[PDB]
Amino acid sequence: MKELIYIEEPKILFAHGQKCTDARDGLALFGPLNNLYGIKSGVIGTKQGLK
Amino acid sequence: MKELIYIEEPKILFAHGQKCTDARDGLALFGPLNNLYGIKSGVIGTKQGLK
């Protein structure tokens, strides 16, 4: 018989010094680290692509 | 006795589609034209410069 070992989950960090094992859950619960104000986007393409 | 002619002020435009004559008053009554979200800044210099 061969023997296996287990390794625990490492956990990741989010806003307010809160730890979670998932990024989706930690983002929906706490939020990201830094503070952006807003994304200004440039769109290059056809008309239907822009729509 | 030569004659002088007078030319009216051209006026400059602001937010809300509002025309004024002085830039200072038109920035403190209707604000700028485009809509940013905030200015992220970089500083290069000594410690006193950052202070």
Structure description:
It is classed as immune system. Keywords: sparta, TIR domain, NAD. The entry is titled "Structure of tetramerized MapSPARTA upon guide RNA-mediated target DNA binding". The structure is cut from a larger assembly and holds 2 copies of chain A (51 residues). The first copy, chain A, has 2 helices and 2 strands. In chain A, 22% of the residues lie in helices and 8% in strands. In chain A, a hairpin with a 5-residue loop joins strand 1 (12-13) and strand 2. Chain A is elongated, with a radius of gyration of 20 Å. The first copy, chain A, starts with 11 loop residues before the first strand and ends with a helix. By secondary structure, chain A is α+β, with helices and mostly antiparallel strands. The longest helix of chain A has 7 residues, at 23-29. The first copy, chain A, has a two-stranded antiparallel ribbon with strand order 1-2. At the A-B interface, loops of A face loops of B.
Comma- or semicolon-separated keywords:
51 residues, 22% helix, alpha+beta, Argonuare, part of a larger assembly, pAgo, immune system, 2 helices, two-stranded antiparallel ribbon, sparta, 2 chains
